[PDB]
Amino acid sequence: MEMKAVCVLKGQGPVEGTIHFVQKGSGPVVVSGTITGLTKGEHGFHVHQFGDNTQGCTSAGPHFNPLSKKHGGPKDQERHVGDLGNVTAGKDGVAIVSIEDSLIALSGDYSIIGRTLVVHEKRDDLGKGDNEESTQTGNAGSRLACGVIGIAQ
Amino acid sequence: MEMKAVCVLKGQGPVEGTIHFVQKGSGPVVVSGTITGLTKGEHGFHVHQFGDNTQGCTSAGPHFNPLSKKHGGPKDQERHVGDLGNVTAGKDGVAIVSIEDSLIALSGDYSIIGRTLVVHEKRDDLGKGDNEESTQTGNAGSRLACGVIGIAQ
Numbered sequence: 001m002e003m004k005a006v007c008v009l010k011g012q013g014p015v016e017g018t019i020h021f022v023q024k025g026s027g028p029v030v031v032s033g034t035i036t037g038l039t040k041g042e043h044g045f046h047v048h049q050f051g052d053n054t055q056g057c058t059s060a061g062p063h064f065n066p067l068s069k070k071h072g073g074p075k076d077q078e079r080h081v082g083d084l085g086n087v088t089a090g091k092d093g094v095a096i097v098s099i100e101d102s103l104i105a106l107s108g109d110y111s112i113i114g115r116t117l118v119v120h121e122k123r124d125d126l127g128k129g130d131n132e133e134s135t136q137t138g139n140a141g142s143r144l145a146c147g148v149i150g151i152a153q
Numbered sequence: 154m155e156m157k158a159v160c161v162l163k164g165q166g167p168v169e170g171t172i173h174f175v176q177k178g179s180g181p182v183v184v185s186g187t188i189t190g191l192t193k194g195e196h197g198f199h200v201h202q203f204g205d206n207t208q209g210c211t212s213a214g215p216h217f218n219p220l221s222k223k224h225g226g227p228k229d230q231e232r233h234v235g236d237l238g239n240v241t242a243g244k245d246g247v248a249i250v251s252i253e254d255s256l257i258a259l260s261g262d263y264s265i266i267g268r269t270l271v272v273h274e275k276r277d278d279l280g281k282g283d284n285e286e287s288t289q290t291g292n293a294g295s296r297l298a299c300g301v302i303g304i305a306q
């Protein structure tokens with residue numbers, strides 16, 4: 001039909017945001033919203049496996065990866081389902097999120113409902129880095145803020 | 154086979170806590186955990202429709218009610234799917250949560266994954282209060298804490 005989701009991001013520092021998700025039937029998922037309190041530049045942005053905030057962002061576990069692939073950018077065939085690339089903040093610390101993705105979903109096997117959205121300290125190298133870390137996390141560094149993706153009206 | 158979920162309760166007051174959920178296939182959902190910071194006595198405990206924390210606990214919307222029934226206690230035939238009745242806090246303000254429910258699920262149309270768990274200021278009257286409000290909320294009153302229900306390991 002039309003599915004909607006929302007995620008409120010919070011962490012140990014000043015990073016916070018609200019992210020919206022809409023999927024018309026089997027179409028792409030449109031991701032939108034704003035994140036504040038970021039350092040100027042690119043920040044890694046992924047859906048992680050577990051909607052578990054019991055030990056902050058660390059209990060979210062790894063990138064959502066039901067097809068057991070290596071980390072990539074959203075545009076790569078080799079990617080985690082959860083790989084949404086980078087969001088960009090300017091001098092004011094504000095990122096405007098605008099992403100269309102056909103691998104994440106708001107129902108079925110690839111559903112991100114009840115999973116965690118995380119925004120990272122550093123840029124996601126999109127799996128192009130020459131180490132194991134790139135093939136797992138895109139060398140995106142620490143988890144600044146996260147939240148559980150919920151069903152929205 | 155065995156599905157697990159977890160919920161971290163937060164609000165504006167001192168009311169915190171972690172609720173765990175386990176379901177084996179199409180069996181009962183077992184709810185367990187502790188809630189701290191509560192006033193002595195019974196507090197309404199429900200699953201609300203929306204995993205939306207944009208306006209704190211109030212964006213969760215009403216009781217998860219896919220069968221379009223009136224409010225009730227968990228033991229009642231005429232109830233909301235979300236209606237998990239009352240938790241009990243001692244002198245110390247700690248409620249030990251232990252519930253077995255047959256209407257909630259962690260998959261399918263009755264799934265609470267991506268929905269919001271809410272603990273209330275007042276006792277839930279199980280839809281017996283004889284005002285219309287009883288048939289909606291059991292006059293459980295305001296929402297002290299909530300969290301989005303997430304997929305756990």
Ligand SMILES: [Cu+2]
Nearest residue numbers: 044045046118
């Ligand atoms: Cu991540």
Ligand SMILES: [Cu+2]
Nearest residue numbers: 197198199271
């Ligand atoms: Cu409630």
Ligand SMILES: [Zn+2]
Nearest residue numbers: 063071080083
């Ligand atoms: Zn990844």
Ligand SMILES: [Zn+2]
Nearest residue numbers: 216224233236
């Ligand atoms: Zn109800």
